[PDB]
């Protein structure tokens, strides 16, 4: 996260770290959506251009964390993966369209002050809140600058950007399964996700029911925190029918 701040304890209790077993390293963010299900970006698990194709046994998820590098004894919980599910129309060849994946845990994680699921949006919450100017919140342990790494989880609040501005900022083809967020050059505030934050959540706090909803997944950006560029996020509501199908079937 670029130009963010240290999270408060328990501020993002749905935060998940995707952790490579060997070498032991941070791979991506993710989020807890139930006691057995974790949501992330497909490209965190499958990206053939970089020879990335993880299997369940390659990975662990670490839940309830605050410190990036410490083993947070009596606080974090470490879970093994039963099965990975990648959206069948995830477009890794072109533009990361439908950049979404689910991971089912081998056993349920116990909730605590530090471990608690985020809500997924309904159509009405999405329609009300996914509007240009409305701010969401991005969290992660990724790099602090494009070109360095944080002691603890970082947080930044960023405004959703008008779709024509998103499209006009890039040569990549933007789809309805993406939205973008970040400040414009003229706005005099900054911030973005960066490498290591992808797969983590973009959340909004509904003013109707005071609950946090995951509206986006950190998906891609051209660099980090560049003037005139924006971060792109998977549109969670648009893909919720797939989410529901996977959880209902499996």
């Amino acid at each position: 996260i670029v130009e963010g701040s240290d999270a408060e304890i328990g501020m993002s209790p749905w935060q998940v770290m995707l952790f490579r077993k060997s070498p032991q390293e941070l791979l991506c963010g993710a989020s807890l959506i139930s006691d057995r299900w974790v949501l992330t970006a497909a490209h965190c698990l499958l990206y053939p251009p970089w020879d990335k194709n993880f299997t369940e046994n390659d990975l662990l998820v670490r839940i309830g964390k605050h410190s990036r590098t410490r083993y947070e004894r009596n606080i974090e919980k470490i879970s093994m993966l039963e099965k990975i599910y990648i959206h069948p129309r995830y477009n890794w060849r072109e533009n990361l369209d439908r950049d979404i994946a689910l991971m089912k845990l081998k056993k349920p994680v116990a909730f605590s002050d530090y471990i608690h699921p985020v809500c997924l949006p309904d159509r009405e919450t999405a329609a009300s809140l996914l509007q240009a100017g409305y701010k969401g919140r991005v969290t992660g342990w990724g790099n602090l600058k494009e070109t360095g790494q944080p002691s603890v989880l970082q947080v930044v609040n960023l405004p959703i950007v008008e779709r024509p501005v998103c499209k006009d900022s890039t040569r990549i083809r933007i789809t309805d399964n993406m939205f973008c967020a970040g400040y414009k050059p003229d706005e005099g505030k900054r911030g973005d996700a960066c490498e290591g934050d992808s797969g983590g959540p973009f959340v909004m706090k509904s003013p109707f029911n005071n609950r946090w909803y995951q509206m986006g997944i950190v998906s891609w950006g051209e660099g980090c925190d560049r003037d005139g560029k924006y971060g792109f996020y998977t549109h969670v509501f648009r893909l919720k029918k797939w989410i529901q199908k996977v959880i209902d079937q499996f």
Binding site: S5, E8, I9, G10, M11, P13, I33, S34, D35, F111, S112, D113, Y114, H116, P117, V118, C119, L120, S128, L129, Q131, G133, Y134, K135, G136, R137, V155, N157, P159, M204, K205, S206, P207, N210, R211, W212, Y213
Partner: peptide, 29 residues
Amino acid sequence: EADCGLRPLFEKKSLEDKTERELLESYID
């Protein structure tokens, strides 16, 4: 979950985090 999105250390205790108000102030509708 029925309890989703309500943080034990914040919403469940009626405590506000240091920047959530920035989000609310942007929801101009």
